[PDB]
Subunit: 123 residues, 4 copies
């Protein structure tokens, strides 16, 4: 975990995220999305659970990206929840929630759900 998590990861859509997993469960980094109302890099912050494992389980973690930077303001935020599996072919398997800011009338349709798999190799 931690050391194993720090680095550059790529997902199936071609997005890239660079993260640093700190000693006490913090995750900090940047995310560049290959799809969406996203342009350039966005700041990401999250946490991982730093004391994962005598039965080769994954390390649970999550992070958030607010889609606003100096080139775009998409009025939305995405959170990724999943686990890090290390090894030869280490990966982070996630499910994500993308919520857009809406008026109250459209709040029922404000959130998209999806899944992303990240690897150290692209892809």
């Amino acid at each position: 975990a931690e050391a194993g998590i720090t680095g550059t990861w790529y997902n199936q859509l071609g997005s890239t995220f660079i993260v640093t997993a700190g000693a006490d469960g913090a995750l900090t980094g940047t995310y560049e999305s290959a799809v969406g109302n996203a342009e350039s890099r966005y700041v990401l912050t999250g946490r991982y659970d730093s004391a994962p494992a005598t039965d080769g389980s994954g390390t649970a973690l999550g992070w958030t990206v607010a889609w606003k930077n100096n080139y775009r303001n998409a009025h939305s935020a995405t959170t990724w929840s999943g686990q890090y599996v290390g090894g030869a072919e280490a990966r982070i398997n996630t499910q994500w929630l993308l919520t857009s800011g809406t008026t109250e009338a459209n709040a029922w349709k404000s959130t998209l759900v999806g899944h992303d798999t990240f690897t150290k190799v692209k892809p």
Copy 2:
């Protein structure tokens, strides 16, 4: 948003989260869960999109809590994705993903999905 978000919020399960929304989209604080394999306060970190709105839309945001502190290590992490609606009765409406670290055989059943509504009043 931001100022409006900073403070103490409570949800329908009796959990409490105190957050500070910083000038540039950062969210930092603590979360105390009334249910689960959770005991005491846990650190939370997230982001909000700091330039939300000429049509009274909500402010999108998200945060993560890794369920590990000095009293418990639940080997899981939860991410909340939603939006802040301010006003008289301001609230943060969210959907969450709770992922547990599992062996590869059980990874298909590693994530729970739910929804929480937070208010400034409890509840």
Copy 3:
């Protein structure tokens, strides 16, 4: 369950669904949505698990509505997954997935997630 489920239910958005729970786990009926690219009644079909419970647990069930009828064709389908809780104030608590048919380029953003609570009283 079954008998308890058969009837008319209403949710927080003002939608109404009439269902008949058959002896062997089948659910058949119609759904009229108060929001969306929906007009009139749509056919629904689902299942419930007909042998639910010495510890007052809910009865798990699910149903699907394809948003096509003789007045509208929204090219989408919604599935509701949840449980029936009977009693004085019986309710069906659900989480739903609404998938729209998209081109392959937009498949990552094809599904919305939400939650609906149905009661026998409106609302």
Copy 4:
């Protein structure tokens, strides 16, 4: 769609589902799960939206399986929401919700979310 959907499909976990898509949006068939508190075949019912598409979009559909048959009663139900993409390598991409019947105290953790991809070839 419809004709294209009728047949046997397999997913990444080795589950198999045989379905018949009827002329007016109905889906009927059986599902055999390779994982879980599932043994043998279970009945499935759903709907698809029968008038999908001048821009090669997928056909939205959904189905439900209550995990009860003559060999097992898992007190749960799963709904799959997604779209059918036809062609050489046709597939049905889905996201699913598995709800278990719980007591009211545990209702917040009653639903798991996941994703399955089905192909006509196994896998």
